[PDB]
Design a protein around this ligand. Structure first.
Ligand SMILES: [Cl-]
Ligand SMILES: [Cl-]
Length: 187
């Protein structure tokens, strides 16, 4: 089967390294929050839709950061993915969500385990697409109108269109994982 350079670039991006900083402190200047992890500087661009506790100063503490390097380079540029750190200390799942994957004539069901109380669409999108690449042949073929839909316990839903990266402006969007009803993917 056919796969374009566009599909190959989606695959290279979502098979790349995404990592977490847990309960860290960073410093805001303008629309960037800078974190130091080991000796590495990480500058995270804010989107303006973050769900952060209101502060007086430039200190952003008690946050988790899901980091995905864009580009190559000394400083690591990442977009969004800052969330409140977990109140709990148990390290086990906070929610176990029904995940269905439809293909073309068949449906596969499994549970998808979420470890964070408040989680970015950035991290959900990244980890789910990586899981779909590893186990469900995502990007072996042209994705076309393939979508992930995250439905919330109040009936609202979010859509990730799999034929393009998640739009940068949405990467700060944050949800309470206890409110996720189900995840449905049509491939
Ligand atoms: Cl959406
Ligand atoms: Cl929510």
């Amino acid at each position: 089967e056919v796969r374009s350079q566009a599909t190959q670039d989606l695959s290279e991006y979502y098979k790349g390294r995404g990592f977490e900083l847990t309960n860290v402190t960073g410093y805001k200047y303008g629309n960037k929050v800078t974190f130091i992890d080991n000796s590495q500087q990480i500058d995270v661009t804010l989107t303006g839709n973050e769900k952060l506790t209101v502060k007086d100063d430039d200190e952003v503490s008690n946050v988790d950061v899901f980091v995905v390097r864009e580009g190559s380079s000394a400083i690591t540029t990442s977009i969004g993915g800052i969330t409140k750190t977990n109140g709990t200390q148990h390290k086990d799942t906070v929610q176990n969500v029904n995940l269905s994957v439809s293909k073309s004539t068949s449906v596969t069901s499994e549970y998808y385990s979420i470890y964070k109380e408040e989680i970015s669409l950035k991290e959900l999108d990244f980890k789910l697409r990586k899981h779909l690449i590893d186990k469900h042949d995502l990007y072996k073929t042209e994705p076309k109108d393939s979508k992930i839909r995250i439905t919330m316990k109040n009936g609202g839903y979010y859509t990730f269109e799999l034929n393009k990266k998640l739009q940068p402006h949405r990467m700060g969007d944050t949800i309470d994982s206890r409110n996720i009803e189900k995840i449905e993917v049509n491939l």
